[PDB]
Amino acid sequence: KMMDALLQSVSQSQLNADTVEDAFMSYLTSFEQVANLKVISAYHDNINN
Amino acid sequence: ADKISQSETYRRRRQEWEIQRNNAEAELKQIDAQLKSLAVRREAAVLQK
Amino acid sequence: DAEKTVLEKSKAGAQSRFDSYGKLYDENINAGENQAMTLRASAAGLTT
Amino acid sequence: DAEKTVLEKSKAGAQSRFDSYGKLYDENINAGENQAMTLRASAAGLTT
């Protein structure tokens, strides 16, 4: 979903160094937010492992 | 989505200016050959004199 | 012969118009136009 | 000779159309059109 945010954010007529840099820093913000999270609990769907 | 649609509008407009510019250049180019034919036609009228 | 030059070199202009319009037709929707469609439709799915 | 004048002075009109369209093409986006792009995109960054 963050790569879909990226593509439509960068899709425009004029691309400059600053615009693409900012689009990348927003992508990186999303990636960092989804990477720092920690697991709490889990469930195993089947009777046998 | 409105930013993207504005960008695609400006791009389609520029392509229509290629269709127009190429049409004008072709008309300019054919006029020169019309002048070449008339230059001959005038040489033949001096020769008739 | 000069009249022949007039005709064929106006034909080059007609060919450039024909192929340019065909190039706009075959690739009717580019990568940006459908991107807006997908983006606009994603907003419709938040009602539930 | 008068027919020659007709042809060349219509050609001046074709040249004015050609150069005006080229001037619109080479400078396709002015300082205002991209200003709206930057301004519109800045609104997209407030979601987080």
Q: What string of DSSP letters covers chain B?
A: -HHHHHHHHHHHHHHHHHHHHHHHHHHHHHHHHHHHHHHHHHHHHHHH-
- Do residues C13 and B22 touch, judged by C-beta distance below 8 A? yes
How many Å apart are CA C24 and CA D10, to the nearest integer? 31
Q: Does A8 touch chain D (CB under 8 A)?
A: no
What experimental approach yielded this model? cryo-EM
C-alpha gyration radius of chain B: 22
- Do residues B39 and C1 touch, judged by C-beta distance below 8 A? no
How many Å apart are CA C21 and CA C33, to the nearest integer? 18
Which residue is associated with the tokens 């709206």?
D36
The subunits that touch chain B, with at least 3 C-beta pairs less than 8 Å apart, are A, C, D
A29: Cβ contacts below 8 Å, ≥ 6 apart: D48
